[PDB]
Structure formats: structure tokens, C-alpha cells
């Protein structure tokens, strides 16, 4: 409780300036110290489910050898907005591994939907999260309907704490086999969409992997990350936002500032 009270006031000021709600859970994997602010509230996942989607693909690849190399062909009707990689391979197809990398590193929507289909839809991804001990995560819909971010709607949400706990298990714990774990970390490390979020709070000499989400309404956006500071154990953290009005805009700077506060609360000199 000590570190959480250390940062309670600055978090309240930050979210009031933002005009919405900020949810943060950060875990120092060395000491076990944690920082929480609205950490048990539900926030829309938006694209952040795509990280867990790729982890679920990797988990299945442990039992289905050759799953990652399977070519997937798709039609033009699969190309929903923000499919920047898959639109370039419409005439050729892509492998499951390439779709997973595109989903993680470019937030590719068509790729995410194609991989969701392979796993049995939103319920199949939810089942995977249940299998690692996450009872909070729920995915209910596909891209782009899952972006609705309706106030009070539990569909397609999780909590910052559950996101951080599941991310820890998948990137640092035993939820994935060692080769699949490293592949998940490497995909997160290569993300291209989060330079202005948690990464903006992380010194250049620290390794970081992240997955972003941006719903586009209700001030709703997020990022989760694993951060490897030099000389100490890694930090896992999740930063989620929402706001009361549909037209409220999200703020990357607010996500970065919340990440800064979480790291400062943990005592990690950034
Ligand atoms: C379809 O429209 C989209 C899809 C994704 C994005 C993303 C990528 P992500 O943050 O969800 O991962 C950032 C954004 O600003 O707008 C978006 C708009």
C-alpha cells in the first residue's frame, strides 16, 4: 500500500487535467512492489488484445508444430481500416507468424481478425486467458466493432492489474515455453505504434516491448509494456484511459506521463 499512496495525488491531478479516468498497475518483478491507480476498474482493450492474441497463437504452436508457417489467404473483404501490412500481401497471402507480427507490431486489424478466426473467435482468446489464470479479461467482438468503448459496457475489457499480471506470466513467467516466450518478447520489442506512450517514459538504454490500443472514442487508449532497466529486475506495467463523452480525445502524452509516475512510484530512476 505504501508505493500506491506515494503516487495517489499526482495520478488524480493527471487524470483531472486529462478529463477522464486513468488506470495503472505497475509491478517491480524483483521486489514485488506494485503501484496501483484504478487498477481494478475495467477499461476497453481496443487493439491491446492483439498482443494476447499473438501469445495465444504461440501457445497453440507449442502443440501444433508448423502452425506458424501455415499460409493464410484472404479476400479483399477481410481488409478493414488500419490493415497496413496485410493490404500489401492481399494478392499473395501471409503466414500465421507474419500475421501475428503484423497484429503486434503494426496493430494490423485484418491480421487480428484472421488470427481470431483461427483461435475460434473472441471466446477462444478469452479461453486462452482463462487458461493462464486471468478471470478478468474478456473479448466479445471483432475488429472494428470492439472499439465502441461504451461507458459501463464490460464487453472487450480488462483491468490494468489483470493485463499486467497476464503480461508478466507470458513474457517473464512460465505460461509460454521458453522459445515462444522469447518470440513474444521480440514481437513486443519491435512494436512500431507505441513511440509516444510508455516508451516515451523509458530511457534509451533500457529495453522495452509494448502493445498499444486506440479505440478512437470516449478518450479511450492504452499501452502495456515490459521494461528492462539496466541493473535491476524488469518492470511490467499497464496504462489504460477512458473519458465520459464520445467525442473526448485520447492523449498519448497522458499515457506517457502516467507511465512516468508509475516508474517514479516504484523508485526506478528514469
Ligand atoms: C481503424 O483505425 C485505427 C486503428 C488503429 C489505430 C491505432 C493503432 P493502436 O493504438 O490501436 O494500436 C492508433 C491510432 O491512433 O489510431 C488507430 C486507428
From Swiss-Prot:
Binding site for a beta-lactam: 47, 50, 82, 107, 109, 212, 214
Effect of residue 156 to N: Reduces thermal stability of protein
Active site: residue positions: 47 (nucleophile), 145 (proton acceptor)
Reaction catalysed by this enzyme: a beta-lactam + H2O = a substituted beta-amino acid
One Gene Ontology term from the biological process aspect of the record: response to antibiotic
Keyword Secreted applies: no
Transmembrane spans: none
Family: Belongs to the class-A beta-lactamase family.
Name recorded for this polypeptide: Carbapenem-hydrolyzing beta-lactamase KPC-2
Organism in which the protein naturally occurs: Klebsiella pneumoniae
Amino acid at each position: 500500500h505504501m508505493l500506491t499512496n506515494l503516487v495517489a495525488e499526482p495520478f488524480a491531478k493527471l487524470e483531472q487535467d486529462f478529463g477522464g479516468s486513468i488506470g495503472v498497475y505497475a509491478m517491480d518483478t524483483g521486489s514485488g512492489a506494485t503501484v496501483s491507480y484504478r487498477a481494478e476498474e475495467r477499461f476497453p482493450l481496443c487493439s491491446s488484445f492483439k498482443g494476447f492474441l499473438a501469445a495465444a497463437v504461440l501457445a497453440r504452436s507449442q502443440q501444433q508444430a508448423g502452425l506458424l508457417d501455415t499460409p493464410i489467404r484472404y479476400g479483399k473483404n477481410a481488409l478493414v481500416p488500419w490493415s497496413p501490412i496485410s493490404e500489401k500481401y492481399l494478392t499473395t497471402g501471409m503466414t500465421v507468424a507474419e500475421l501475428s507480427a503484423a497484429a503486434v507490431q503494426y496493430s494490423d486489424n485484418a491480421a487480428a481478425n484472421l488470427l481470431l478466426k483461427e483461435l475460434g473467435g473472441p471466446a477462444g482468446l478469452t479461453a486462452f486467458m482463462r487458461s493462464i489464470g486471468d478471470t478478468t479479461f474478456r473479448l466479445d467482438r471483432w475488429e472494428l466493432e470492439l472499439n465502441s468503448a461504451i461507458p459501463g459496457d464490460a464487453r472487450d475489457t480488462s483491468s490494468p492489474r489483470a493485463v499486467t499480471e497476464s503480461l508478466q506470466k507470458l513474457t517473464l513467467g512460465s505460461a509460454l515455453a521458453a522459445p515462444q516466450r522469447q518470440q513474444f518478447v521480440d514481437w513486443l520489442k519491435g512494436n512500431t505504434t507505441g513511440n509516444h506512450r510508455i516508451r516515451a517514459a523509458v530511457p534509451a538504454d533500457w529495453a522495452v516491448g509494448d502493445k498499444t490500443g486506440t479505440c478512437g472514442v470516449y478518450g479511450t487508449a492504452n499501452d502495456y509494456a515490459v521494461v528492462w532497466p539496466t541493473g535491476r529486475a524488469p518492470i511490467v506495467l499497464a496504462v489504460y484511459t477512458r473519458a465520459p463523452n464520445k467525442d473526448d480525445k485520447h492523449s498519448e502524452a497522458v499515457i506517457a506521463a502516467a507511465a512516468r509516475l508509475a516508474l517514479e512510484g516504484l523508485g526506478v530512476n528514469g
